């Protein structure tokens, strides 16, 4: 009636047993009360669904097909289930707690069609685009990872077929803020996103964290703490224009930190990025006219012994930043590269920092590499030409055909 709901004060269902059913029942009530689209200049204002702190099992997928639905909690509730599951089991009764908390949605769905494994599915076809759905300040917990045939401990596979929030349909002005996501194969997957804001979340110990799929425009991913798994994405986007990725602190152990396919006229600037593997920032498949500026890159070795010898399958010639596209701008970045000579792959290679594999007119200027071994600060493959490379390394450190690229060596000594 006033469009405000509390999942613990809804007469149908029990949010401890199946919060999915409770929230779907609330959505049915909202639709039943908000049937008319144009009464007194309104009629479908949406609603807010509140999750007090608590442990809520979700056994039924929530389907969101209305605009202006806010689902909110009172705690992102993150704790490192990765650490706990790797603590010897005999010690567990002495730990102060074992599980995540906050306003906690435990995803008890089977694997899927990865969409069928999503705790929250936002889907609606026809017009207009579903708009201004808000997810705020709650926890989504996939609980366990499971055996995947790799022979790794089940809890270290980053595999369970669960998604936190999956948006399947064209959307406008969505927000995901202050969330906690933990132990999900995919935290947050949003297709066809316009003017989306993913802001100030904690998205960690998920196989993949943020994936923007299909296409999108004018969106932003800001002020997030992000940590993925070795076969997955930390931040991924495809066929986006005008995307802004800034003020994120991305820590291990994603396959990459930022991965673009067909992303144009976007900006990946002023992020702190830390990886245990090469291929931290990948601009692929005609990723063009992007600004990659004033980021702090750190690549070093996994120190945590349960994941020692786990990697993303990419060798040190890959580059920390790899670009396949035209007319990008790579300006003012810092690269710390820490590798041991005896584990450089392939054997005896000179690791590369910035690699230009294809495209023309890439402008690379004023980048500082600090490395414990010799590196190729910039490697321009013969398939990329007419690039401009300034103050990003000495002549030895910039491997490039001087006949078809403009190179200025950083002054030395």
């Amino acid at each position: 009636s006033n469009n405000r709901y509390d999942v613990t004060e809804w007469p149908a269902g029990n949010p401890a047993k199946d919060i999915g059913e409770v929230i779907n029942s609330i959505i049915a009530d909202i639709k039943a009360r908000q049937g008319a689209a144009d009464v007194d200049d309104g009629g479908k204002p949406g609603a807010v669904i509140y999750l007090p702190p608590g442990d809520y099992h979700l056994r039924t997928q929530v389907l969101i097909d209305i605009s202006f639905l806010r689902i909110e909690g009172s705690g992102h509730g993150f704790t490192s289930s990765s650490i706990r599951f790797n603590v010897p089991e005999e010690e567990w009764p002495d730990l102060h707690e074992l599980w995540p908390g906050g306003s906690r949605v435990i995803v008890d769905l089977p694997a899927g069609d990865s969409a069928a494994g999503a705790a929250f599915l936002v889907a609606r076809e026809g017009s207009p685009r579903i708009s201004s759905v808000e997810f705020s300040n709650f926890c989504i917990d996939g609980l366990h990872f499971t055996a995947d045939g790799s022979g790794r401990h089940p809890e270290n596979t980053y595999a369970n077929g669960k998604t936190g929030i999956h948006v399947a349909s064209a959307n406008d002005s969505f927000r995901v803020t202050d969330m906690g996501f933990v132990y999900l194969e995919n935290a947050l997957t949003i297709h066809k996103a316009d003017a989306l804001s993913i802001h100030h979340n904690f998205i960690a110990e998920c196989g993949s964290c943020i994936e923007l799929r299909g296409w999108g425009q004018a969106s932003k991913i800001t002020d997030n703490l992000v940590g993925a798994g070795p076969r997955g994405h930390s931040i991924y986007a495809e066929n986006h224009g005008g995307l802004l990725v800034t003020a994120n602190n991305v820590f291990p152990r994603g396959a990459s930190s930022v991965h673009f396919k067909g992303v144009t006229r976007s900006s990946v600037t002023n992020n702190r990025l830390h990886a245990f593997y090469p291929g931290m920032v990948r601009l692929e498949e005609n990723s063009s006219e992007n600004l990659v500026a004033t980021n702090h890159f750190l690549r070093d070795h996994e120190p945590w012994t349960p994941f020692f010898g786990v990697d993303n399958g990419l060798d040190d010639l890959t580059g920390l930043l790899s670009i396949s596209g035209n007319n990008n701008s790579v300006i003012g970045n810092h690269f710390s590269e820490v590798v041991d000579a005896n584990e450089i792959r392939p054997e005896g290679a000179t690791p590369v920092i910035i690699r230009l594999t294809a495209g023309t007119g890439n402008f690379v200027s004023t980048n500082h590499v600090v490395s414990n071994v010799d590196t190729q600060h910039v490697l321009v493959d013969p398939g990329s030409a007419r690039n401009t490379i300034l103050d990003s390394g000495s002549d030895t450190q910039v491997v490039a055909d001087r006949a078809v690229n403009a190179i200025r060596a950083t002054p030395t000594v």
Copy 2:
């Protein structure tokens, strides 16, 4: 009594009919209970006014003249009324919804003295400065644009004399966060602002979005999604010092993206800016000692046919970034310029990217322009001198008097 109010649980008035009267009545109650300024080290702590999701007509301006008032909702509620009003009317009954939603304040005021058309007016004279008023997570909707004599469709004029929030008086530590503003001639106009934060709002389809007027200090405009109209401002400030404009995604179709008059010692950095017209970033009237860094600029052509041939009246010689002032710093920006040779104005002109019209000592370094036609990457008018221009174009691309400016051409080939 506990200083928490809900507009749907206030005995006087009806928030569906006139939420303005309801909120003014609440403000009167707060003042009546909080009369003494110094009882037990306190006495005027303010209050919070909650707007549940719903459609609320405002027929009376809300006057806020107390410090520490928070007005909060549960949904920014944006949908594109611009798209809807341009969809053929016969199809409207098949649309899933027609209007914005969330915690929605429908501004049913007549035009004004633009202040008289504001849904919320913050005004108080005397001392100290009104402080720490907070606007959070609600929607302000001006409902319709109206005929303005231009012969454009009424809904495409961006003209109705309505303002969302107008702050007339000197203020300190104000916040506007998580808001939605739609279909207002002016979304948000704040005069005399100290240490203001305008953060993570969605401010779109308004004639002008953010205007900081009169003067101010130490303020910031961060993480906003902003889109204005062709005669208005996206982000505007005058006589501000120490302003930080960062992490915004500004999309069309403002006259400009960022417009400064007499703004000094401020920073416009790490924004994504997209316009359909020249004059995207304007530093005017002694705008000096500002940093304009690592922004992504895109200028291209309006693709949406209802606005085809609508422009901001400025030609391609204007520049994407135009500077009239001293000692600014323009560093690490990316400029994508997309124009068709046959529509360049004036006929046969070479479009300019960065223009220095007046002032001395401007430092312009390491800027990358990508353009489908030849451009003047930097044009230094004779009225601007003693500038330093580095790695922002070849010699041909930097039009400047070498006798009185320090120029280093980007190395070529």
Copy 3:
């Protein structure tokens, strides 16, 4: 029972008299109900404690030793007690208000062991790290500063032995957001912080604002408004790796704006920084491999007469940015330096902007200084060598041994 508490609806104690006792009593209730760590895949989800707007005296320290506790209010409640206490006392009855407001915690504790003076202490030993505690949108007010033997007015000393929030123990995924802190000797002191976010706070008129002590990793300090006192820190961190400090607007009058000791592989970029003293950004004691990029620095003279002739004890040879460490990256910064020749200390010195006191391999490029007098844009002490200094000043403006540093002078005339 639903884990949601309101301090004005708790039967034990009176939050006006001692909110500390009320909140401790709530914490005891949470622990009593949440005793089991593993019941139905949960058991200790934590809770949320709500503070409506009001004036609450705290006479007992709150001890937080549970994970996933959120303490939230409805107003940051800042007003300038500094201005008020310096307004002649006869005029106070004509001021509209005298005190801060919002959801206000008045810290009525004696001085301490500074931890004993903290309104909120977060402490817990053993495993795992206390996690995902959230502080949101309330005000913490230390009420008065006191005589410190300096002979300054008591209210201008920035000394009272009070701390707002003190985190003593190893912590993960903490958040401090939307807070107001005022008139505390230390606003916010967090030891041993992993993946912490201090975001969008107003932390002003405190002796020191933000201190990250002991060690930490992967944390961020973003979008804050910060102003400290002349013997204290605005933003301080020690032994942190992977720290991101961005989008902050730091205004006077801290001893410094950003101070690092033993901080590595971190980023201080895209902040607006204003000081009345030298030594604005200090990288000390092996602060290495940090990016300091696209910041706007302003150093000028204190204009406010109650603090005229108060300073941080550092002379103009200190530098605005001082670096003692290896392999840092200083890129794209703007420095406005405003000093009067007659007050330069020591007499007749040429003030320095960037100083390299020790370490090797620092990369300093494309920095713009604007100064009303001649300055040493970069001073490389003999104890720092093998640095690279590009486009940060003419030859005269870069004081450095050319035999052991790579220098390119900014082109002139």
